[PDB]
Amino acid sequence: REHWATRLGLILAMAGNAVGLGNFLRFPVQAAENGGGAFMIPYIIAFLLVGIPLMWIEWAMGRYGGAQGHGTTPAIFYLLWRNRFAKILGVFGLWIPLVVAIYYVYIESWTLGFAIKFLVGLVPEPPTDPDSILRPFKEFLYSYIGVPKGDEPILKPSLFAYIVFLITMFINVSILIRGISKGIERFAKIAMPTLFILAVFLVIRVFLLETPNGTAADGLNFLWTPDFEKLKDPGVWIAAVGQIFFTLSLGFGAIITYASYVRKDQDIVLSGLTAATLNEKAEVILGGSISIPAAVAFFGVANAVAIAKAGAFNLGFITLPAIFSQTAGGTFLGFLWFFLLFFAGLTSSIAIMQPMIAFLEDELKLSRKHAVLWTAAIVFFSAHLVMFLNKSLDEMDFWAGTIGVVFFGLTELIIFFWIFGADKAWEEINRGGIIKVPRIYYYVMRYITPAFLAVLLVVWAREYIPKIMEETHWTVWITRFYIIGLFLFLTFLVFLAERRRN
Numbered sequence: 001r002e003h004w005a006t007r008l009g010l011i012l013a014m015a016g017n018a019v020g021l022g023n024f025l026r027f028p029v030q031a032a033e034n035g036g037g038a039f040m041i042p043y044i045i046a047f048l049l050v051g052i053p054l055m056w057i058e059w060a061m062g063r064y065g066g067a068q069g070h071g072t073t074p075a076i077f078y079l080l081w082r083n084r085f086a087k088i089l090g091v092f093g094l095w096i097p098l099v100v101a102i103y104y105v106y107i108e109s110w111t112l113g114f115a116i117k118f119l120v121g122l123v124p125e126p127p128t129d130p131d132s133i134l135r136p137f138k139e140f141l142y143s144y145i146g147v148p149k150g151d152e153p154i155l156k157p158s159l160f161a162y163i164v165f166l167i168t169m170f171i172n173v174s175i176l177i178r179g180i181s182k183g184i185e186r187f188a189k190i191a192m193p194t195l196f197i198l199a200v201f202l203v204i205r206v207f208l209l210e211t212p213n214g215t216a217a218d219g220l221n222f223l224w225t226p227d228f229e230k231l232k233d234p235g236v237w238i239a240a241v242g243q244i245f246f247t248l249s250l251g252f253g254a255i256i257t258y259a260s261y262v263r264k265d266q267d268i269v270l271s272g273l274t275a276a277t278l279n280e281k282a283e284v285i286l287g288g289s290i291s292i293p294a295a296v297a298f299f300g301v302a303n304a305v306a307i308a309k310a311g312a313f314n315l316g317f318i319t320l321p322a323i324f325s326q327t328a329g330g331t332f333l334g335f336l337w338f339f340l341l342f343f344a345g346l347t348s349s350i351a352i353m354q355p356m357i358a359f360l361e362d363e364l365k366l367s368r369k370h371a372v373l374w375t376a377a378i379v380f381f382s383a384h385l386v387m388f389l390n391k392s393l394d395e396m397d398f399w400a401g402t403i404g405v406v407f408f409g410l411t412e413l414i415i416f417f418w419i420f421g422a423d424k425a426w427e428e429i430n431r432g433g434i435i436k437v438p439r440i441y442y443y444v445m446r447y448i449t450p451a452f453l454a455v456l457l458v459v460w461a462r463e464y465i466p467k468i469m470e471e472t473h474w475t476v477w478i479t480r481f482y483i484i485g486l487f488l489f490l491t492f493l494v495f496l497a498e499r500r501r502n
């Protein structure tokens, strides 16, 4: 089996996995919609009772399976529990990262295209009216991704966006095709430091933004000022948990696959804790100090929150660059922003394609080159659905990146810490650890976490089940049909692997 060359490289690779578009895009939006500081408490708790324990659990399962030559859940679930249904459940550790990869890499290509155009200096040019400043950039983004005027099921992506998507796929492939230590690690050791530098620079520059309508400091206060009136709102807790899952790459099967390349005897405790901590730092300190403080700086708090609620991409791809355009050297600043976004996205995308690649390599005994090329082919092909079909992206992000990751987290936790046994699991987690997990967490993993997640899933199901059946748009039914197809495909591949074993 292939392994990480150094501990540093491992740390930065896992951190690259975690730290991504979820930090600089999803987080600011989630925190803004949820009332700033009010969102932070549930966010921190969710980080302690969910993110950390699941992170460790996934590192442990990953290394455990990796020792036996298995980097994916279909096999690992079977090692931990002997059943066919364990494999069928394991299929999600493929389906999820694939589905997410499909749209995620596309958004990444967006950030790349914007990076290029902002570098070369082709951007809308604003003239004191907010709408006259934002409109040009809204039109810019819409032209880029081909957004329809009314609500029209069909998207018309510009040739440039398509070509940039191809390029992005090529970059992902060129990194992935060189393997774990040479391709992923070597890139992480660069991209990560570059990312931190750019993020710090942007944070400072933004902090320097002050106008008659507000300041960045106001945004920081808004984000860090506690509000206890929202603690009774379940939605805030649900959003916090979702954000924790997404940002830490939990339930994506990615952490597990990365961990399967850690040597059996190496410590996953301190490495895991370090990766998670790095992610949280990149999220709350960096991600939260850029977009929101700038939006609040120019348009004030109320308007910043309104913009945040307007959409996820509205803040990152429209508002922020429109704000930058009003400052000296704002175009270059925008460029730095989108470049940061790009590296952050790439480091994650490689991570989510790696599970499929690893299933092909381990189970179907394919060479790395072939596995990577086929994974790339599948992702690229399926991506046309997200590119040309309006609302498809949201649907995939929902079923995979939202519900699926939680369901899968609960599933893996239940299999590892219950069926496989709690004591054996604990011993497996602490084994070889440079430091040991606090005893209390044993009771957190076995009782608190699974109960919390189960409750969450119950609420979610209760709310969504009625809504699902009545939905007007055909694009979402097409997307559902297709991703179900992907699930059948993956299940079939698992079947073939199983047969090959015999």
Ligand SMILES: C[N+](C)(C)CCOP(=O)(O)O
Pocket (backbone or CB within 6 Å): 082, 083, 084, 085, 086
């Ligand atoms: C999960 N199941 C009970 C339907 C099938 C189990 O089959 P097997 O893994 O015991 O052979």
Ligand code: MET
Pocket (backbone or CB within 6 Å): 017, 018, 019, 020, 021, 022, 023, 100, 104, 246, 247, 248, 249, 252, 254, 348, 349, 351, 352
């Ligand atoms: C594409 S890997 C899962 C999401 C990633 N952790 C992020 O926040 O961007």
Ligand code: NA
Pocket (backbone or CB within 6 Å): 015, 016, 017, 018, 019, 020, 021, 343, 344, 345, 346, 347, 348, 349
């Ligand atoms: Na990343």
Ligand code: NA
Pocket (backbone or CB within 6 Å): 017, 018, 019, 020, 022, 023, 246, 247, 248, 249, 279, 283
């Ligand atoms: Na993250």
